[PDB]
Amino acid sequence: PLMVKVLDAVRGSPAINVAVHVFRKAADDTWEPFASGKTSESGELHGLTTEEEFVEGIYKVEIDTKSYWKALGISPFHEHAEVVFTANDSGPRRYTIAALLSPYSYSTTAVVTNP
Amino acid sequence: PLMVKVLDAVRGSPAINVAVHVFRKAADDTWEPFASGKTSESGELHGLTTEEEFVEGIYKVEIDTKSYWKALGISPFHEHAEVVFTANDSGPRRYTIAALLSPYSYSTTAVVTNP
Amino acid sequence: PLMVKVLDAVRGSPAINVAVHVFRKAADDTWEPFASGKTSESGELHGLTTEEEFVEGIYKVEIDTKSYWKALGISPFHEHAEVVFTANDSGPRRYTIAALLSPYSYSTTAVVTN
Amino acid sequence: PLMVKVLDAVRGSPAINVAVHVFRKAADDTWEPFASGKTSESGELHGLTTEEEFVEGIYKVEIDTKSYWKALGISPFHEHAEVVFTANDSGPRRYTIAALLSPYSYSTTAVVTN
């Protein structure tokens, strides 16, 4: 129900081994850790959560773009790329969060489907 | 060896039934029709060409964004989104051309892999 | 030293009257309010800070995109857009944080000049 | 009535000294030269046309991104970036075509205002 895909605009490639952390806003307004993982060789991160676990809420997907760039030997501008959204509030949906990275820029889009 | 994927930034969905035309620059500097098709329900267009057919050259991928938006009842800014690039000049590669559409904007990226 | 510019990809216009908050990362890793305002008719927000006040560190620029889209009657995806970056004195002196908004997407870039 | 602004997503800067050609679509569907120039230190290209000369029709803005990246020693994907649009008198009067460049990607938006 939640997939993250990351691409590299410099190399024209998937962004591999990118760390991703997902948080969910708690009742006390803090960000509770929800799930995390690493993008694969395809730039995709599968298996973050389950339909059971992925309840309604406000979620933050933090993509650790700085660590990615530094590993390639590049000093980038941003610390991370964030995506903050309400999920599943009209029932379960499937979300893909895609991000396209450059050293001084990023872009993100959501693909939301109703199974 | 050549795949086109198109997403809708307004709807948060694949861009379905988007017409795509591919041209190749001829010896006389004109744009020769090469291949064409329509994106599927996934926003993907597969089967445009073959490794045999897809020789070195300068290719133009024209995504008919205006027709897409007009079909949804929207008057968009651009006539089409173009992607013009040299392909296969250091041997066969696999190219994905991805585009993300809004009524007054688009973005495109290439994912190039060496099989 | 810090300007924010916001554009609307749906209407093909500056994004006008958008609330923007800037935070600075504190020692305890919390986000402390630093500066804020609303974009002008040109989509720009000037006068956030001064050379004196804007020191090296980690900053977060939060753009209230959800209110923006609601006010235009358009259904949005994100709660807000965030841009988190380090200000570095060895690079150029003036930072422009630009954002391009769609309902289910946004893009941001930095234009850092002297 | 027509301005072009180009930014560099790799360096976080305006894209300076980039060649830009504008064409207008002719009756025979061919592309006729209309205006051209090079971006300034701010990444902007002003003075392309006048209100008088800029009539409704289909225009193509070609940005020579390949030369730009080559001059910086960076390997590029695209031959050029294109932006093809219709000028419509029922909409606002001033058009800004903005482009954000990376080696394997670009983004473009229109800012159309009165």
Ligand SMILES: Nc1ccc(/C=C/c2cc(Br)c(O)c(Br)c2)cc1
């Ligand atoms: N600017 C901008 C922002 C995001 C994107 C997404 C590309 C994208 C490519 C593949 Br292939 C794919 O499977 C998915 Br899902 C998404 C492109 C351009």
Ligand SMILES: Nc1ccc(/C=C/c2cc(Br)c(O)c(Br)c2)cc1
């Ligand atoms: N993805 C994407 C596409 C386009 C842009 C444009 C940024 C932009 C910056 C400044 Br300063 C300016 O004056 C104008 Br007019 C436009 C940003 C991100």
